[PDB]
Amino acid sequence: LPASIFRAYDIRGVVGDTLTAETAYWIGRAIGSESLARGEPCVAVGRDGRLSGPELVKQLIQGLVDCGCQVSDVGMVPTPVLYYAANVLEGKSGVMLTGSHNPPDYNGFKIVVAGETLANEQIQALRERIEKNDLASGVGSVEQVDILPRYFKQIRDDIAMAKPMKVVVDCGNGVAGVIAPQLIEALGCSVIPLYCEVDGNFPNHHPDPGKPENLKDLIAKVKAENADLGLAFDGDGDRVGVVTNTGTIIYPDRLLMLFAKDVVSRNPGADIIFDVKCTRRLIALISGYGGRPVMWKTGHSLIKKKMKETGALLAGEMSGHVFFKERWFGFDDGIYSAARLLEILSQDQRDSEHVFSAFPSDISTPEINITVTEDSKFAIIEALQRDAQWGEGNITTLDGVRVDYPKGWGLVRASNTTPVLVLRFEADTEEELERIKTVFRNQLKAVDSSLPVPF
Numbered sequence: 001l002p003a004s005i006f007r008a009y010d011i012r013g014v015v016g017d018t019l020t021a022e023t024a025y026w027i028g029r030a031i032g033s034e035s036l037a038r039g040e041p042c043v044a045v046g047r048d049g050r051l052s053g054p055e056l057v058k059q060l061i062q063g064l065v066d067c068g069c070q071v072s073d074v075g076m077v078p079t080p081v082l083y084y085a086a087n088v089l090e091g092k093s094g095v096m097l098t099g100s101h102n103p104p105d106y107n108g109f110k111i112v113v114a115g116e117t118l119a120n121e122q123i124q125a126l127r128e129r130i131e132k133n134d135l136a137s138g139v140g141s142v143e144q145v146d147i148l149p150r151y152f153k154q155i156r157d158d159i160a161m162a163k164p165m166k167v168v169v170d171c172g173n174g175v176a177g178v179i180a181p182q183l184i185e186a187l188g189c190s191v192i193p194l195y196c197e198v199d200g201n202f203p204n205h206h207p208d209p210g211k212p213e214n215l216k217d218l219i220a221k222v223k224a225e226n227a228d229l230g231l232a233f234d235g236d237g238d239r240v241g242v243v244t245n246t247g248t249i250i251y252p253d254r255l256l257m258l259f260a261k262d263v264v265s266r267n268p269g270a271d272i273i274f275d276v277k278c279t280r281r282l283i284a285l286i287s288g289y290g291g292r293p294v295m296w297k298t299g300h301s302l303i304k305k306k307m308k309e310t311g312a313l314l315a316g317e318m319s320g321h322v323f324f325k326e327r328w329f330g331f332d333d334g335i336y337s338a339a340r341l342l343e344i345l346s347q348d349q350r351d352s353e354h355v356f357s358a359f360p361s362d363i364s365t366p367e368i369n370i371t372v373t374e375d376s377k378f379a380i381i382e383a384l385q386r387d388a389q390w391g392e393g394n395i396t397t398l399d400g401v402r403v404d405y406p407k408g409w410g411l412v413r414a415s416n417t418t419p420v421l422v423l424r425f426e427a428d429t430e431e432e433l434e435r436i437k438t439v440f441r442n443q444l445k446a447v448d449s450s451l452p453v454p455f
């Protein structure tokens with residue numbers, strides 16, 4: 001199997017190129033062997049709505065079965081629903097076959113073994129098992145499990161909206177259309193569906209709510225229908241995007257402000273995690289409400305590990321992965337997060353635009369990406385960590401280099417899904433934004449005067 005599909009957070013490739021039916025089989029063998037090594041024969045398996053789902057999922061399941069595993073096949077579900085299954089069924093292991101928000105031919109695996117989401121050297125360990133033939137053999141079993149109704153009822157019965165709302169829901173032709181519109185209506189909303197038919201060809205916009213262009217249709221519809229809110233899901237339902245009644249995009253770091261207030265109000269002193277791409281305004285806001293802000297590495301699998309380590313009641317990433325432990329299970333879930341948002345908004349007399357505009361804002365860049373190489377991105381970061389001078393500031397190197405200044409902050413880090421450096425900048429004023437950009441531009445050029453600096 002190609003090494004390149006074994007990534008930091010999970011496995012991902014292109015079907016017909018780096019991911020075939022046979023590699024899905026051996027990945028199933030490897031996961032089953034690792035689960036058994038951790039004492040867990042019981043494994044849930046789910047898939048998203050991609051074209052390659054049926055072909056690859058059968059092989060994944062056979063690989064698990066051929067270890068001696070007891071597989072619970074939950075069929076076509078959102079990623080969080082597979083995570084739910086791995087929390088409520090017999091077994092604490094689960095595999096989701098998904099290509100996330102990527103183009104149609106992409107697929108991959110998100111993997112939980114005996115309660116832990118695998119990352120980094122644990123994903124490499126799977127590849128290594130296959131190479132070594134360090135694989136279990138046995139005669140396992142498959143049971144079909146219809147888990148969606150349980151998940152639906154679990155959420156519906158713990159969410160208590162105080163008034164009706166009208167909501168536009170954009171599923172981007174991904175798998176969130178099997179439940180999100182239905183569940184949101186059942187909470188007590190009217191729902192206007194956009195692209196809620198599951199279609200692995202993704203013929204409209206790609207289901208990636210992190211890009212403003214993929215929210216254009218949602219914003220227009222919210223305005224046309226005088227809706228209270230717009231919601232967008234990514235292809236597998238573990239990420240959410242939000243638009244107010246006036247069309248304002250609420251980026252997930254500011255969504256987390258509302259959620260943090262809510263969670264900490266019932267849980268004094270609670271740890272709240274956010275990734276290094278999130279606004280500095282979160283640190284102060286969480287602290288102000290008496291929570292403990294914990295900044296951590298970008299990447300869903302890494303955030304999930306960190307919530308175990310810290311006992312955090314809530315986590316969020318700038319990409320829109322949001323992780324409730326309070327009243328929930330601790331995994332990222334766009335659908336559940338949407339429900340939690342609707343609950344909070346429904347108890348406020350103000351419209352969603354005014355609820356969010358009350359919170360402090362800074363001037364922010366769009367994400368900046370610089371393409372480098374897969375085999376050099378980490379060395380560039382290492383060189384910056386070794387050599388760079390940032391002036392006076394609070395320097396964090398837990399993921400790349402982030403510097404928090406009195407009036408703003410900047411970040412440079414390596415993506416773990418693409419061969420790029422990722423940068424963000426925010427500040428109180430345009431002048432400070434430019435000062436910080438200049439510091440980062442000059443430190444990049446000091447490492448390699450040939451690096452693009454497209455900011």
Ligand SMILES: O=P(O)(O)O[C@H]1O[C@H](CO)[C@@H](O)[C@H](O)[C@H]1O
Binds near residue numbers: 299317320415
């Ligand atoms: O490419 P990156 O930045 O490493 O990772 C990106 O994809 C991951 C999977 O969606 C998310 O968890 C990160 O928040 C996102 O930034």
Ligand SMILES: [Zn+2]
Binds near residue numbers: 101239
């Ligand atoms: Zn996703």
